[PDB]
Design a protein around this ligand. Sequence first.
Ligand SMILES: O=C1CCn2c(C(=O)O)cc3cc(Cl)cc(c32)N1
Ligand SMILES: O=C1CCn2c(C(=O)O)cc3cc(Cl)cc(c32)N1
Ligand SMILES: [Cl-]
Lengths: 240, 239
Amino acid sequence: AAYKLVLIRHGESAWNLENRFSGWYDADLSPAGHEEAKRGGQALRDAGYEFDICFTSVQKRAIRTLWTVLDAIDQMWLPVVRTWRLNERHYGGLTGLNKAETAAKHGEAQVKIWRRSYDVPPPPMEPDHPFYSNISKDRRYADLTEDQLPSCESLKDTIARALPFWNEEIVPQIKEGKRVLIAAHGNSLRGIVKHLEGLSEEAIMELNLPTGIPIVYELDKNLKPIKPMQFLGDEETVRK
Amino acid sequence: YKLVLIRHGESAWNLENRFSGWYDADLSPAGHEEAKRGGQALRDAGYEFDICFTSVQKRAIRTLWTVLDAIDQMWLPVVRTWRLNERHYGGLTGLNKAETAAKHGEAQVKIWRRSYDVPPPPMEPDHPFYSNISKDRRYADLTEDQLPSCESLKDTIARALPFWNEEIVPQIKEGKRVLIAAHGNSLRGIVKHLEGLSEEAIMELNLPTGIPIVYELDKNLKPIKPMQFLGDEETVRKA
Ligand SMILES: O=C1CCn2c(C(=O)O)cc3cc(Cl)cc(c32)N1
Ligand SMILES: O=C1CCn2c(C(=O)O)cc3cc(Cl)cc(c32)N1
Ligand SMILES: [Cl-]
């Protein structure tokens, strides 16, 4: 094909072990998730992949995934571009709650509505929320406009603010011939996969990208996939 | 304005004592610990940055990664440039002191050590690093004039300072707090421009490794006080 694009979703975080909603909270990788990034980078190294530019979020679990990959493939010298538009979905007032706290406060019906819905956001993260200063006042977002800093996101909102970065900054690099690596999160990568394959709301909400595994697209000159996405790795991990 | 430089520490296989140059040596464990200590000094002092500059050489890049991790600023933008690379030591790259004297003689090696504008011999096709460096992907867009076979110190500073002038100075002037993680001779180039040092003075300057180097600059980017070092009092005095 004309072009080849590689995505990687970061693995287990510290808050995953606590089964807390992270969203925009800057949870680090857990030791296991860091090991996953190492395995994915080894897969890219064995396959001989080369890149010219990398994109990631401003969240350290993705940035550390990308760092671990670049180390494994001996491409630490590549230019790296960080953007809040590749961040995980903003889970609003659910941020920091675990499964039990969420069910206790909102009930199983409302939580299932939020889980299955494409465009119903969770509650806003209000100023008295325990992580409100930690996230909404973090200087890394100081240049966002009032309308851009979200208090909460549905998957629709998340995709809506990720796709502008893809169209304006990633697409030109790809069409310039640069080999792109994107290290990011489940829901932002959902936005990209939905755009690439023209998937339905229901189809994207059923797609669970694997973590720590290189996802390869072969793209024609209009950036439309010529075949299904492929996973890199040994036979076992590729199986699962 | 506040500007921080950090020079990386020890590299693998004693290569900092072997004219490591443009060979892309990794940090040794000890040099990695040096970087962790420097980053911890920066965190203890509560430093914040807005943009970071480094070379295309992984010992500098890993030093900067370690510092960003230690100060919880992995989200900062990072700009890599070959213009901040270590001095290219030509045919000497990879040789220890005894091998250098054996091959070239004491008198010649002294001349290269003491001279500001005489390069070592070029790195030839038979050199074990010749294809490893000169055909490396990362230098593919360099023009023939730009990609060295060897550099005098003058050469190194001449190719570093254009990057300083065109990319770092505008950021300092916009008020962004700049961090630079680079190498001995490229940082020498910056320090020589900042302090207007002479050739003999810059050749006598040996910047310490793993130590944050803080500059306070006025509206003209002219230092207002001598460079200061960060760390516990023990290592600060030493430096
Ligand atoms: O990607 C996902 C799936 C996992 N998920 C769950 C769960 O119980 O597994 C609840 C939930 C709620 C919201 Cl608003 C978004 C979610 C949620 N995003
Ligand atoms: O920064 C330096 C100082 C250390 N140095 C020595 C030494 O014996 O310490 C020999 C030498 C030769 C060249 Cl061409 C450049 C050097 C050299 N660059
Ligand atoms: Cl980086």
